[PDB]
Amino acid sequence: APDLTQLVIGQTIGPLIVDAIDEPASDELSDEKVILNQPSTRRIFNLVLKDAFAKFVQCPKNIKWGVMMLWNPALHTKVLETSINLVKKSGTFIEDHLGWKNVGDGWIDFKANVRLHGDYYNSVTEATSKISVYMGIKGSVHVATKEFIMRGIETGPTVWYNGIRYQMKDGTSIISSWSFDEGQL
Ligand SMILES: [Hg+2]
Ligand SMILES: [Hg+2]
Ligand SMILES: [Hg+2]
């Protein structure tokens, strides 16, 4: 297990470089009447890390959050399920800030800064680590028809692992792939 607790910006550690070191329950979400009456979407955030990162820090390659987002006059977020690699019930999905406007025909266009978190327990070291994903999302909602369109991720996703932002040694992302498609776990 590498010691990742005393790092500085710019350092190389194994196959990685350190880019940064200072990381930045409503009843409504569980009421099928609210879900019926409001624009909502159920999505999976599927994260696949590169092998060299995953093996080095001893964190599994594939992490998934099953989430819901709901628009309710505003943007409400909830983790429904996580992949079995994350500590049970440790997943969180939070909206930090939101901007929106009416664009006519009863549509609203929005951008939000959101973050996912979860804990991972290493059974060899018996230590728990924190995974964080920051992203800026864009969407559109139509309250009358209850339509919620996810129009993509504009900033991020940016992964922090135990409060450190890594890149590969060659400056590329530690992420192999990600998706934020409709679905549930
Ligand atoms: Hg990880
Ligand atoms: Hg907010
Ligand atoms: Hg990670």
Tab-separated table of N, CA, C and O in Angstrom, residues 13 27-28 80 98 105 132 148 166 185:
chain	number	residue	atom	x	y	z
A	13	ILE	N	4.146	10.165	-7.964
A	13	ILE	CA	3.989	9.098	-7.001
A	13	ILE	C	3.505	7.888	-7.799
A	13	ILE	O	2.493	7.913	-8.473
A	27	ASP	N	-38.033	13.584	2.578
A	27	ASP	CA	-39.130	12.646	2.322
A	27	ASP	C	-39.643	12.699	0.867
A	27	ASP	O	-40.251	11.739	0.397
A	28	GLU	N	-39.444	13.832	0.184
A	28	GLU	CA	-40.018	14.079	-1.136
A	28	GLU	C	-39.449	13.100	-2.168
A	28	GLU	O	-40.171	12.649	-3.062
A	80	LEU	N	-29.779	6.181	-4.947
A	80	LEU	CA	-30.650	5.018	-4.707
A	80	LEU	C	-29.852	3.770	-4.337
A	80	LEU	O	-30.307	2.971	-3.510
A	98	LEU	N	-26.891	25.928	-8.604
A	98	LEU	CA	-27.816	25.758	-9.689
A	98	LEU	C	-28.047	27.127	-10.335
A	98	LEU	O	-28.182	28.121	-9.626
A	105	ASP	N	-42.068	27.897	-24.262
A	105	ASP	CA	-42.783	26.654	-24.500
A	105	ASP	C	-42.882	25.875	-23.184
A	105	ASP	O	-43.147	24.687	-23.188
A	132	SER	N	-14.465	11.038	-4.523
A	132	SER	CA	-15.309	12.195	-4.812
A	132	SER	C	-15.303	12.429	-6.316
A	132	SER	O	-14.253	12.308	-6.928
A	148	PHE	N	-37.666	15.378	-18.131
A	148	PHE	CA	-36.382	15.799	-17.606
A	148	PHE	C	-35.334	15.292	-18.589
A	148	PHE	O	-35.193	14.081	-18.717
A	166	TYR	N	-5.398	13.448	-8.819
A	166	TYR	CA	-4.291	12.860	-9.573
A	166	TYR	C	-4.535	12.964	-11.072
A	166	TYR	O	-5.658	13.001	-11.553
A	185	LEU	N	-29.461	0.506	-10.958
A	185	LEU	CA	-28.651	-0.657	-10.614
A	185	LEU	C	-29.572	-1.816	-10.171
A	185	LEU	O	-30.555	-1.506	-9.431
